Design a protein around this nucleic acid. Sequence first.
RNA 1: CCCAUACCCGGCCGUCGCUGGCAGUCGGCAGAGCGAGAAAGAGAGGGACGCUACGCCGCGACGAGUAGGAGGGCCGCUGCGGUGAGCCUUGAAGCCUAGGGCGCGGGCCCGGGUGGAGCCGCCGCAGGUGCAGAUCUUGGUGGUAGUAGCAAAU
RNA 2: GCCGGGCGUGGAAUGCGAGUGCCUAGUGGGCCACUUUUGGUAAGCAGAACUGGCGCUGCGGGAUGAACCGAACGCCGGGU
Lengths: 128, 187, 147, 104, 53, 106
Amino acid sequence: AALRPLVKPKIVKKRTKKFIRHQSDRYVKIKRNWRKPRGIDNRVRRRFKGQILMPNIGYGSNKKTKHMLPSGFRKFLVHNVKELEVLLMCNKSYCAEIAHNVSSKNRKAIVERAAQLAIRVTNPNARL
Amino acid sequence: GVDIRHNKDRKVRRKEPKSQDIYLRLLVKLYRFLARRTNSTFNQVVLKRLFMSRTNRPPLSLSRMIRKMKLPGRENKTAVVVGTVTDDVRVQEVPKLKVCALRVTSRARSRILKAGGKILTFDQLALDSPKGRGTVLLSGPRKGREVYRHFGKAPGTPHSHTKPYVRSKGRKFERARGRRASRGYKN
Amino acid sequence: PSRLRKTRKLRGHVSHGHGRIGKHRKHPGGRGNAGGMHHHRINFDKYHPGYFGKVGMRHYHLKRNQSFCPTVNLDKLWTLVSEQTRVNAAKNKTGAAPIIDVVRSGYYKVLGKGKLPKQPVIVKAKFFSRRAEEKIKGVGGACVLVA
Amino acid sequence: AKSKNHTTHNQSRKWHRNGIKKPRSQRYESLKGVDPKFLRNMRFAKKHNKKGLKKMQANNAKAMAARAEAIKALVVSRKLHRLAYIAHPKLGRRARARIARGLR
Amino acid sequence: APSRNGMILKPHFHKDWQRRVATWFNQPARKIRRRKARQARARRIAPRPAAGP
Amino acid sequence: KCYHGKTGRVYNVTQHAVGIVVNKQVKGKILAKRINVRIEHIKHSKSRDSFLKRVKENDQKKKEAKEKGTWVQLKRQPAPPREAHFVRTNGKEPELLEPIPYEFMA
RNA sequence: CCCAUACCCGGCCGUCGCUGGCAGUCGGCAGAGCGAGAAAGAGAGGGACGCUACGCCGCGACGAGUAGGAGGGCCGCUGCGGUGAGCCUUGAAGCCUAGGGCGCGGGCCCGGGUGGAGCCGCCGCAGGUGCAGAUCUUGGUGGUAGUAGCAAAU
RNA sequence: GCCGGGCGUGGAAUGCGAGUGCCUAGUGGGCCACUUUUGGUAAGCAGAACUGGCGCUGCGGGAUGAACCGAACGCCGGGU
């Protein structure tokens, strides 16, 4: 009963786990965000066996399915009802996403307008 | 494992002008079309010369193109120069000219047009001659800048007539030891 | 624009673009133009020949206004007068030659650097060269001196 | 605290990176260092080369026409060879019109 | 520590110059002070000319 | 001593000497430097005339055989593999060879 | 017979090259081609998509990397000029999160909770702009540890 | 040394687009091996030549290992 996309291709990802910073587990000051090790003796840097993996461009997702949700759509942030009339001609490709700070009285104007324009919403059941 | 060197496989050349001039960027849109759908190699040279930096398209003097158009098998063809045509005050008579340049100085317009000449722009050149038929593509003196007199072999070298960088010239600025045979040595 | 400078791309890299072995110390070679006759000897011979020593006579109280003599070539000689003057002479049939007052334009000495259009002039200058006098005479003009 | 004194180890490798370029050959190499007395004469022979201008134009021209009289006094098998003639665009048109009637 | 081919420079900064740097933010306000007393000068001697003798 | 063996070309001839333009390799670059040498340390190099001889026949065989209408080879081709041929072994039989035993010669 | 990140085959990413291709979306003022081994002429007497040309598309080949160099950041931080008839007490910033996701990555967008008043996107401009280290500075808190210890002078 | 005119079967094989100019960082402690080699009884010692390595480099093998043998690396599936 959903608003199915144009075509639903088999998404295939080269890697699904995140990349963790080196020694980000052993410390709390070392946050999880990736930082390339530049040390002169660093194992991770010189690609030793059985270490953390360094992100290359070889892990790049297919351009046919890049920035594509599991539902076969692509997100687009929306702030008001006027920023929806843009997406009325990309119905089968680009879904709509209401921004966070949009109040609850304005969200129940966007969603049914997006039901009129047949645009899919990824966060319809909001604060409500 | 392939035994090659990737040292110089990325060819260093301009593929679009660094300038953000939209009138210049509109001309390139016009000549990108003419370069690839006409077999005329004239448009490929003009396309390559539109990309270049100002130091690579030096100004053409007015007397230089007079000197190059009074050559025999000419005087019906059109003058095409990608740089700019400055007026030369040291020439008196001006023949009638058919000029196409990117920019013409205000005095060089009034002196050309008073001689019954004709000044064209590159959009009008393509309309009058798409394949570049009957034109003479010219260029100003490229190594005429003051900078090249410092280049070459270094000064203080045997037979290396190269201008050094001095803060001021005078009798006591680089006239001593390296230059006089009386002071040590000279080259 | 600090956002275009290089240091934005050096954040994270340890030595900040100055090498680990040869660190960025205060002054490795000395301050200023030091070591001219010494450890920087090759740089001063290869790029500033003649830097060291004295030549010539020490003139004490040099007053630049005395040695003031801005030259003008014969190529751009007619540019000192209007185009109306240049045409009204080749059109004139009495042989009336215009006078070009060089000193009025700002120059003092006349040097002959090129060709002249063949119509006489009487250049009211202060100094002349030999070749400059030849060109004006050979065209059919005159060289009058003034102080 | 002694150290190494001299070694030509990495050098041969370093030279062949940008190649060992042979010196740039060019016709008309410079006439520098040639002995003056011979050169001083050579500049005189070039100074007086206009002297024979009329002779030279009136020597090769009468030699230009003298060349125009020596000319004026004169002026794997046939099977694959055949199939190579039908298979030619610019000069096999008349040939393969015989096959076009073979269907007719 | 000179590099390759450059120019031999002698900056005159070996003294302690950062104590006597005369900046010019007076300049826009200075002109107004000049002009507003140049008009008030002419107002005083109203029939006499503005440039003076 | 760095030119003893090196070959160059003459560009200036004096009474008892010649000027030569010879190549000298100096640390990864070649320099075409001019040296003045007396005649006594000089020979006409024959590393060239055998090509000058080859130019004669190449100019000879191009003018000749042109009126014959034929096309004859001019370029030097390297030594090819030899062609298939026979070997007559008339009457006699190839002698059998045998490795000799060891005789300690000292 | 076993297996390397080597070689072959196939996919995908990126870089490089072809200084590759595309303005021809030329429609009842129409007639749908320029893959063709061969220097040159389909010469005149009612119809999907596209082409932010700084866009799109097709082929090949290639991919290690400290010091160092450059390019791109729709990576991030703070302020300014513009702009979004932008968001906000029907809940902004900040913070928490076993929630749902995207990006190779820097990072980001949603859900929920808390909070109570301001904040952000885009095009430009500006910098005191991104931390793991410096026996770093200041603040705070652990392990040691309920341990040593609380024994000079009846 | 000048002109002028005439001769292309491009005159060995193989491979590959070249030329050229600016501006320029880092570096200027190196170390190991086959072969050659000087001093030393010798040394994981000191000093050179040539080439390749290590440094700057993971991977398979030598149990282990800066350098040995194989082979150099985008992310994956199959085969070898």
